[PDB]
Symmetry: D2
Subunit: 296 residues, 4 copies
């Protein structure tokens, strides 16, 4: 199986005057490459995939591909949709335009059954010849890819190689790797990066790495090298920021933090996402001063 593992970042999508700041987007990606990151995920949940047009979605995939060219950093392009024809369209674009693989979030809002999720992902996996990483985040989609469905998709489709798990369910992560230890389990929840990696997980898709890419890189690589003491220490070190980055719905805190660190020009979202409250704004500012944030 072909895979994409290691320390990965769910890139924020900077806006300026309501448009994707394409120069700042590329700038942020090269900052990730320079700080030990193994792969970048354009237009995931953290990249405000919901409010980008299909054209902007595609633009941000191409920028990631262009900026990572000439390096060892892979591109795992966000390609999910709650409509299978929409997800297939995104997957074929990412293949044809040079992405190393795709991330595909479980369909949100329309709650497909497990049988529907299987056919959804099998159509996607058969749409391309590049690795496909499932992405389960039931708190946002309203659905769960059961362990049995994940395992069936891994075993039945050649290019489905693992799942990015954002469920806060360490039992499921044991369940997955005890019954199918060949899969690539990916942490989609920063606070429990170390526990998931300690159990055989092979990488992270991080929100915190937007702000602290070097710390997430070191954590992941220590862990993959089985230096569990140093991986755990950084994970414990990062707990406060890992949780404060979810005082409000992601990516509202991380974009506030990137703005507070001077890494993006304007604290702009697309509705219905918005600025945080002034209280959470101050709480984000207060957790940040305790960490050293790399610039460009």
């Amino acid at each position: 199986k072909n895979i994409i593992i290691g320390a990965m970042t769910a890139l924020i999508t900077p806006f300026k005057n309501g448009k994707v700041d394409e120069q700042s987007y590329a700038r942020l990606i090269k900052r990730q490459i320079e700080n030990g990151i193994d792969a970048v995920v354009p237009v995931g949940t953290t990249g405000e995939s919901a409010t980008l047009t299909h054209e902007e979605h595609r633009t941000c995939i191409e920028i990631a591909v262009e900026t990572c060219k000439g390096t060892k950093v892979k591109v795992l392009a966000g390609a999910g949709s709650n409509a299978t024809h929409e997800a297939v369209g995104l997957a074929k674009f990412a293949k044809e335009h040079g992405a190393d693989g795709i991330l595909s979030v479980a369909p949100y809002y329309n709650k497909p059954t497990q049988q529907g999720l299987y056919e959804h992902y099998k159509a996607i996996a058969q749409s391309v010849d590049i690795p496909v990483l499932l992405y389960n985040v039931p708190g946002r989609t309203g659905c769960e890819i059961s362990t049995d469905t994940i395992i069936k998709l891994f075993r039945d489709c050649e290019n489905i190689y693992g799942v990015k798990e954002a469920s806060g369910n360490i039992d499921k992560c044991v369940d997955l790797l005890a019954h199918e230890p060949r899969m690539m389990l990916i942490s989609g929840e920063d606070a429990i990066n170390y526990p998931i990696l300690s159990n055989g997980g092979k990488g992270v898709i991080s929100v915190t790495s937007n702000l602290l890419p070097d710390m997430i890189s070191a954590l992941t690589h220590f862990a993959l090298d089985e230096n569990y003491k140093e991986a755990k220490k950084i994970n414990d070190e990062l707990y406060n920021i890992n949780k404060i980055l979810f005082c409000e719905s992601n990516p509202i805190p991380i974009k506030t933090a990137m703005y507070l660190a001077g890494l993006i020009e304007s604290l702009e979202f697309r509705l219905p996402l918005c600025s945080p409250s002034k209280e959470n704004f101050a709480k984000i500012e207060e957790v940040m001063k305790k960490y050293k944030i790399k610039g460009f």
Copy 2:
């Protein structure tokens, strides 16, 4: 305030050969008209809004508007989206093409904050001059429109006149109508249609009415006439079908029931939606036998 209340149907969207069966859609709508319905909701959750293109979405709004011409039946067009610019575009389309009002689902997947939900809906309400009904279904979206937010939107925007509640939270329906008795509370959960109407609710947006439009019509109108004994009697008879129509994710059962009743030619969904299991297929078939289903 202008309002759209009474017995309403979240229309299934019949497809045929992967395309919207526009002839069957029109037939099904007039079947609702023939059976006492006060309103139709094109392309809600039950109409598989997620898997229709923006074109198809717009086509189904126009067909509903066209089919209701010459009758009292209003069109409450599904116009929700998790992207505010998409929701405004759909709202403006529904206004310009003759819809009587719009339904606007709470943004799914990206779970905006309460402040974000407020600004999301205020942009929608100010984009048009026709009534807007909020739609809260936290089980599918991942977010909740709090009671205060609903009440603030009702009081701050002229055309926001109520909410379609699909939360199974009779506490919240008391909260809403106790603090703002002028709002139009709409039941979005068939099994508890009568309790919501019993507490001052002014209508339903029904899944069951697709199959039994006459019974949901009678139930709602009895309740509005304060014949609570008869409204409860119908609510109690329909419990079995009201619940089995959610054996699997709506609209998989209701489309299965319509197919088994010979009301749609094809048992068609768009992926990631699918046929139900054979066991649930038979369980739907067996609940139907205790109800008399109207034809065309």
Copy 3:
């Protein structure tokens, strides 16, 4: 079946110097009688059954029976336990000492299966010949008496005549009375007393009635007389106090309110229950100011 319905109060148990204030207990019950209450529930959840000894538990049943003799007020004695031999002992004591019936909470902590719940209650019901009311409050017991189990127990044992439902599940309340309309559904959740009564519920076991017995009785009797407009009016008026009485875990707010009204000597609980926070103390004090509180 013999039944105990109407407006009922889950009596607080006042303490003085760590002991049951037996004189205040009788005074409070007599005050309930004077304000239209149909039955009182000694030593329910609101009566701190967990922290009373078995003899103090038995003393409060005896006072309730004695204080209610010669009046309209029935005694529905709390007799539940998570140990069946304990629940049987309490039930037989209540029978032997003149209680008109018993309430019996679903076993807490040890989460018995549905078959265990049937055998638990069948043992209780066969131990006595007085009415037995089930009590479902899963947020505190960790288990739920399923709808099928309640109905089976209602149909298989003569003296099991209904359930006190404190689950916030109006769907379940429709489920119960649609399949078994002969049972006595009792509201155990003050905020939604009216919706439960509107659907055929036949009484309440109220926490709020400790403070405002006149309003809760009147609400119940309006509803039972099918004056749904006045029943709903009181339910809506009472929402703020009904909810503020759960800012902290019942019976901490109601005892705070009773103390604030000059209805009990001191604000004493038994550990692990404690006085509320300074915030919730002031919030309770101020919601009370909007209601008229009856004296002795």
Copy 4:
């Protein structure tokens, strides 16, 4: 601080003719001693704490103490109660009768606030001078001891040295050990023993160890020696049995397994607990075949 860590067993309580089989209790304890166990927990949740009288509860503590003398196996006596005067009484008994420490479950049913839980445990901790391990199991108690409360209790009371977590919340386990790394975090959830130990947890109080004490012992020790690859392998091997032992409410499956293994004479159980369903009886039987079960 004095501590009790390592591999520990929540002992089942065998019954015979409705009575505690005290000879079987001693044999079962000695089987644990001979299979690498570091501690035994008499009358925990798995010991049917709820349905034992206070006298039998005390009998089983003394049997555990007597059987472990002359060995290194410590006794961590179950001493919890939802009444503080009851919990203090048990703690004083265990201290006076030679127990090495006490486990004390969070109060069930009566849902104390965080302030009450603090005072509940502080009263317990000051009643004795032997180690006290908190026990958080919100699925059974209806309350949770927050991370802040646990940390306050550990730092403020000398003999409170850790917590047995049965919450399925690996985030909370990172939270606990990142902010207070001196505490002894103990796994109370067999399926995720290794992840909790992987993050700095220092032991388990296991249900599976009743049946497979050697494997749970080996896992624990490997993990404590930071041999995570052998600990994880055992944890993965044990997953199927670790979950099947909760197909029904613990301790119904483990007692079924012990009976099927010929380690107890009768499948007793004290109401409201009951023998499992026929199917689940067969499912547990089946799962057992994949493990080598030690005799006496």
